[PDB]
Amino acid sequence: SGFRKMAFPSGKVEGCMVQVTCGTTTLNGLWLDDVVYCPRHVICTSEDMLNPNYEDLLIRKSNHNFLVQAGNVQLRVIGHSMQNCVLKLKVDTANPKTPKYKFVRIQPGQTFSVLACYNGSPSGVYQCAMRPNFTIKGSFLNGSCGSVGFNIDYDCVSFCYMHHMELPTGVHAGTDLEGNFYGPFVDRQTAQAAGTDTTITVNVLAWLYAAVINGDRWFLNRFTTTLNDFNLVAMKYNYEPLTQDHVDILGPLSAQTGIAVLDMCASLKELLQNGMNGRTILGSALLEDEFTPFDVVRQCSGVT
Amino acid sequence: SGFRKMAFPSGKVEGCMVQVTCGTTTLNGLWLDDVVYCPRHVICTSEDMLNPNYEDLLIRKSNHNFLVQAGNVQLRVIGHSMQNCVLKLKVDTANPKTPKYKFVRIQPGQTFSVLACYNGSPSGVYQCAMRPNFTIKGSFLNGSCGSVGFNIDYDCVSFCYMHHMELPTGVHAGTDLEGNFYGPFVDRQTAQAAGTDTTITVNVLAWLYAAVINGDRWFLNRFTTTLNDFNLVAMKYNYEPLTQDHVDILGPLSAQTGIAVLDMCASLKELLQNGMNGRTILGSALLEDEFTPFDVVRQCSGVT
Numbered sequence: 379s380g381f382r383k384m385a386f387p388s389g390k391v392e393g394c395m396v397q398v399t400c401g402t403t404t405l406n407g408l409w410l411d412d413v414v415y416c417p418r419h420v421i422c423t424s425e426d427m428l429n430p431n432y433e434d435l436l437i438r439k440s441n442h443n444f445l446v447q448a449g450n451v452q453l454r455v456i457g458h459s460m461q462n463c464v465l466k467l468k469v470d471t472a473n474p475k476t477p478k479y480k481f482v483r484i485q486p487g488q489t490f491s492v493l494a495c496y497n498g499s500p501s502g503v504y505q506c507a508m509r510p511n512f513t514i515k516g517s518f519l520n521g522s523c524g525s526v527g528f529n530i531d532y533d534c535v536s537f538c539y540m541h542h543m544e545l546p547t548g549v550h551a552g553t554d555l556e557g558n559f560y561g562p563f564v565d566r567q568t569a570q571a572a573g574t575d576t577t578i579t580v581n582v583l584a585w586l587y588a589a590v591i592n593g594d595r596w597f598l599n600r601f602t603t604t605l606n607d608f609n610l611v612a613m614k615y616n617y618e619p620l621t622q623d624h625v626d627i628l629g630p631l632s633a634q635t636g637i638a639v640l641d642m643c644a645s646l647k648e649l650l651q652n653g654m655n656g657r658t659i660l661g662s663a664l665l666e667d668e669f670t671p672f673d674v675v676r677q678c679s680g681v682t
Numbered sequence: 683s684g685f686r687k688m689a690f691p692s693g694k695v696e697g698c699m700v701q702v703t704c705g706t707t708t709l710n711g712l713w714l715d716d717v718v719y720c721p722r723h724v725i726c727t728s729e730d731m732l733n734p735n736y737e738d739l740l741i742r743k744s745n746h747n748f749l750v751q752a753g754n755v756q757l758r759v760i761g762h763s764m765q766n767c768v769l770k771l772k773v774d775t776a777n778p779k780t781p782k783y784k785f786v787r788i789q790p791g792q793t794f795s796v797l798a799c800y801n802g803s804p805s806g807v808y809q810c811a812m813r814p815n816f817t818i819k820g821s822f823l824n825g826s827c828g829s830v831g832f833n834i835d836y837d838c839v840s841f842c843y844m845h846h847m848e849l850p851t852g853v854h855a856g857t858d859l860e861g862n863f864y865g866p867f868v869d870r871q872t873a874q875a876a877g878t879d880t881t882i883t884v885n886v887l888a889w890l891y892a893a894v895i896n897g898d899r900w901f902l903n904r905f906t907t908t909l910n911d912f913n914l915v916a917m918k919y920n921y922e923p924l925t926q927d928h929v930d931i932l933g934p935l936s937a938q939t940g941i942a943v944l945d946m947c948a949s950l951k952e953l954l955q956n957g958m959n960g961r962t963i964l965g966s967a968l969l970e971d972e973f974t975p976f977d978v979v980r981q982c983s984g985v986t
């Protein structure tokens with residue numbers, strides 16, 4: 379029993395974290411085999427940051443300008459390239475702790491674990507969703523750029539996020555591991571605004587199913603709604619439209635609990651219209667949207 | 683910026699998790715040097731669980747009755763003993779991945795990270811507080827007994843919790859790594875009730891300071907309260923008495939934010955009496971008490 383925001387065990391990623399330094403600028407890098415991946419703005423000075431031409435700044439760099447530190451031992455750089463907004467440094471040593479891994483680019487509404495690091499050294503791990511406006515609501519201080527987000531599937535590490543910047547609003551923006559930003563953002567020090575955010579409807583519904591699996595039923599009701607009548611209410615409360623694909627993704631949870639998806643949508647409608655009136659769901663006094671249906675299945679019992 | 687429930691990186695503990703089997707009963711063990719630690723009820727059958735005499739059951743065991751599995755390789759047991767409610771199995775191989783570690787017994791209100799494991803294999807990590815009634819509100823399924831809770835201090839792993847059982851109310855009870863239960867509980871399959879729980883006042887105050895460090899101030903007010911007048915309100919809302927030691931522990935946070943502790947207590951009083959009226963603090967619609975002052979300092983910026 380119980381339900382908590384649960385991160386993946388971080389050990390496989392811990393063995394990959396290193397430190398990359400260019401001038402007086404240090405951030406974190408990811409060491410897989412004989413390549414170190416880090417944000418390309420490590421090659422910028424505080425001057426260059428306002429509007430850099432990275433192709434210009436990189437052609438003025440040599441290999442020995444990059445200091446890569448894996449714990450105590452320096453790694454010698456033997457080659458460097460640029461792939462979108464990530465720098466790739468070839469080094470003369472393969473990481474012996476390299477896990478099975480892949481790089482994947484995720485969709486908004488999907489979750490991952492963040493290993494927050496400072497000077498190449500892990501400090502903590504937490505769970506995040508990619509918001510619909512392509513930011514994450516992270517916990518990051520100066521020095522954390524280069525930290526990665528990841529999922530784990532049967533000892534294969536799927537890296538999906540590299541941290542590049544905090545926006546003026548205090549939320550966080552970054553790229554996949556091939557350097558492509560999530561959302562419209564660019565890697566320069568200018569005030570950039572994210573689009574207006576929305577609530578991830580399919581995830582709220584998954585979390586209501588988690589609550590039922592855990593024995594909490596107070597929010598259920600005898601009613602059902604049509605998908606279209608639900609979305610009219612969803613739109614009014616700044617919730618994402620629910621699609622037939624979302625309905626089908628919630629199939630397993632519906633089947634384990636005997637509550638039809640559109641049945642659960644009528645509960646969500648009533649909760650949006652009337653609030654909770656002082657009650658809590660899984661220890662929360664608001665509707666939580668950072669658990670995917672996969673997250674719920676992974677953590678909850680297969681029997682209600 | 684940002685504030686999230688943050689676990690310690692779990693890699694150092696991942697390398698210690700093993701599987702212990704006695705009869706048809708399997709749970710998790712902790713492998714440090716040449717000793718495996720696990721809950722002693724692994725030697726019980728479903729019959730024995732109602733009211734076991736463990737000294738009786740253990741003297742009827744031999745070393746070869748214990749199957750210890752570290753990944754794929756079996757570890758050969760060469761000796762076994764009992765220390766309170768933990769079994770200790772000597773094995774013929776020292777764990778090469780043994781970190782620097784110690785065993786510590788914590789106070790209620792302190793937090794730790796849980797590495798949830800099944801069949802010796804880590805599945806996830808989350809943060810927990812030891813409740814005032816000595817339970818934890820964990821997330822555990824069948825098979826998780828043997829999972830450990832821990833803090834990390836400068837690459838030294840301080841193990842503080844081993845998981846032994848879920849109570850009929852769905853909360854969780856266990857021991858320190860020397861086998862002493864937290865709270866009044868015993869390791870037998872009977873319905874056991876925990877004392878009535880209370881809210882950890884010093885932690886709520888720490889979390890209000892986290893909110894101020896992160897730029898949220900809406901709950902402050904111009905008033906102060908005396909420690910005794912605060913506790914009269916605390917008692918009315920089932921909050922723990924606040925001690926002068928708690929006041930002094932919150933010294934650093936008070937100093938970083940310029941808000942006197944008793945000033946913050948007047949904010950807490952007003953929040954208890956009037957609620958939040960639809961507003962949130964650090965993304966929460968209730969007052970959160972599972973962050974210690976140490977947790978706040980560790981995660982938040984040293985500058986407001």
Ligand SMILES: N#Cc1ccccc1C[C@@H](N)C(=O)N[C@H](Cc1ccc(Cl)cc1Cl)C(=O)N[C@H](CC(=O)NCCCc1ccncc1)Cc1ccc(F)cc1
Nearest residue numbers: 419518519520523543544545546547548565566567568569
């Ligand atoms: N994580 C993180 C982090 C956090 C603090 C310091 C440092 C770092 C990492 C570090 N690497 C990094 O992100 N620095 C970028 C500058 C930058 C570097 C490189 C690149 Cl490519 C782009 C950018 Cl923008 C950074 O300083 N951002 C500022 C962070 C900041 O002051 N927030 C205040 C939050 C206000 C608030 C909080 C809560 N509620 C409401 C409001 C915001 C900002 C300021 C000017 C600007 F013009 C663009 C952005």
Ligand SMILES: N#Cc1ccccc1C[C@@H](N)C(=O)N[C@H](Cc1ccc(Cl)cc1Cl)C(=O)N[C@H](CC(=O)NCCCc1ccncc1)Cc1ccc(F)cc1
Nearest residue numbers: 723822823824827847848849850851852869870871872873
């Ligand atoms: N974690 C965990 C876990 C969770 C589920 C299954 C198995 C395990 C691990 C496993 N190892 C283990 O804990 N089994 C013990 C039995 C036991 C083994 C060994 C020892 Cl030493 C002591 C005890 Cl008590 C266990 O089955 N408990 C029950 C778990 C349970 O049904 N909860 C229902 C929750 C109801 C609820 C939920 C939410 N909101 C309100 C109410 C509760 C219980 C039942 C009878 C009894 F008499 C004592 C306790």
Ligand SMILES: [Cl-]
Nearest residue numbers: 481482483484
């Ligand atoms: Cl794809």
Ligand SMILES: [Cl-]
Nearest residue numbers: 785786787788
């Ligand atoms: Cl002590």
